[PDB]
Amino acid sequence: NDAEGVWSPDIEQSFQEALSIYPGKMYGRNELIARYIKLRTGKTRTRKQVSSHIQVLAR
């Protein structure tokens, strides 16, 4: 292969810009789940209760 040439300075600069633009994680997910529950049931559950519930169900 190469690595030095595969990731040349111009490519590496574009790569870092794309890494800062496109995240690895879905931001605002717990708020979206809390909103969906509210619209569907009419009941209020917070982003924090949603986050805590995801952790309990994953363990």
Side-chain angles (χ1 to χ4, degrees), residues 32-46 49-50:
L32 284 164
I33 296 165
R35 183 188 167 274
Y36 183 89
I37 295 164
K38 181 62 180 181
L39 297 175
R40 289 298 189 112
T41 69
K43 295 163 186 191
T44 302
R45 292 304 181 267
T46 212
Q49 284 172 300
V50 163

